[PDB]
Design a protein around this ligand. Structure first.
Ligand SMILES: O=c1cc(O)n([C@@H]2O[C@H](COP(=O)(O)O)[C@@H](O)[C@H]2O)c(=O)[nH]1
Ligand SMILES: O=c1cc(O)n([C@@H]2O[C@H](COP(=O)(O)O)[C@@H](O)[C@H]2O)c(=O)[nH]1
Lengths: 218, 219
């Protein structure tokens, strides 16, 4: 996956007009948008096709898929029907649940991203202790796309070690949650940025600023 | 706690609006509580919750397995309750802050949170099972009153009932298609969740009635 400027916009605004306007304001800087449940549950799955029509951007559906295999298959099918290029799935529910998603992605010509360790403080309770094993599970299953935490560069580096340089790694927690863009790109292929851009007085200048700060990494 | 008719919750995971409505309507006399998940919501929109409320006298539990950071969890819960869901189901494996985010929105909005503790499918054995007792205890500590646990592992369902106590409300999926027994599950759960055994049956109403006949002495 070739992400413009190594920068993925997390579009978590919850109304269509604002989401479209802000995305339009930063369109020159990105070509990949992560759309999650905040926007989809507020405006419907048709918003994905709308983004594709307006911007041609790739769409990663951040749905943290975390059900039994049978339900996971249905969720992926509905998601790809809506035009998503990729879906993000949790590894904590185990290998069968991940495989269910890989099957549908293969059928519809899409990608699965595996979330290995999350960025927020609560990730320390249960997820962090399982994270290396979840990463190895991804490797065993043939997963090629991963998500790991900008807020813990040492853990992000370990995840990169496990999955290898061939795998694709994206990383949220940059900006609002405290992660640094350049440090994160030592290990991740691309950074995910939400509030630092979409809540900024001037989203375009915020994106431009982040890009300026990592210009030597592009 | 919610008064679940016949201790039976329909898992409405058909992805077609016409079929979902038909089947739900056919079993309406047996079931006043419907679990709606992402298979149906992602296919037909959040307005499906509105349509079920309009058409049927049913409570709606939004099974969204909420599993994000606290800030995003808050947004998901707000949108879900705004749409008319009585309750939402959240994961505990992302930790206490993520659960608390959901509880806070539910408190503010006058709705309820269910916490998923151990899941019913084989893969749950890899990571979830080992965390499940602690996730349940965490729930108790956070003041969670409603829980989900697995019909497919009676021993685990029993332990989870112990941890959360008799006053807590416990619902349990994995009955029928996944191999769990209605009667045995109701030894520990307040209500059973049933999907395919009902919605894929030639006569969903007869399937529901048959489940209910099998547990008649437990009502
Ligand atoms: O570990 C993770 C995984 C995520 O997907 N995310 C998501 O990435 C985005 C981060 O947005 P923000 O830059 O506003 O903190 C949100 O959509 C959040 O749900 C995260 O923050 N941490
Ligand atoms: O541990 C769990 C938790 C669930 O919510 N579920 C959900 O309960 C329902 C089970 O449906 P069924 O009776 O068709 O197996 C599905 O909606 C599934 O997503 C589950 O099967 N196991």
């Amino acid at each position: 996956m070739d992400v413009m400027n190594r920068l993925i916009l997390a579009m978590d605004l919850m109304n269509r007009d604002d989401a479209l306007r802000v995305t339009g304001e930063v369109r020159e800087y990105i070509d990949t948008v992560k759309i999650g449940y905040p926007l989809v549950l507020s405006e419907g799955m048709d918003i994905i096709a709308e983004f594709r029509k307006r911007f041609g951007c790739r769409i990663i559906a951040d749905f943290k898929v975390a059900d039994i295999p049978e339900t996971n298959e249905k969720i992926c099918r509905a998601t790809f029907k809506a035009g998503a290029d990729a879906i993000i799935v949790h590894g904590f529910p185990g290998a069968d649940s991940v495989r269910a998603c890989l099957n549908v992605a293969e059928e519809m010509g899409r990608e699965v991203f595996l979330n290995t360790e999350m960025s927020h403080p609560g990730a320390e309770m249960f997820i962090q202790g399982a994270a290396d094993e979840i990463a190895r599970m991804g490797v065993d299953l043939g997963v090629k796309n991963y998500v790991g935490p900008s807020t813990r560069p040492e853990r992000l580096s370990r995840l990169r070690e496990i999955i290898g340089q061939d795998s694709f790694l994206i990383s949220p927690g940059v900006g609002a949650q405290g992660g640094d863009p350049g440090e994160t790109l030592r290990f991740a292929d691309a950074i995910i940025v939400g509030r630092s851009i979409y809540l900024a007085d001037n989203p375009a200048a915020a994106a431009a600023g982040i890009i300026e700060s990592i210009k030597d990494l592009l």
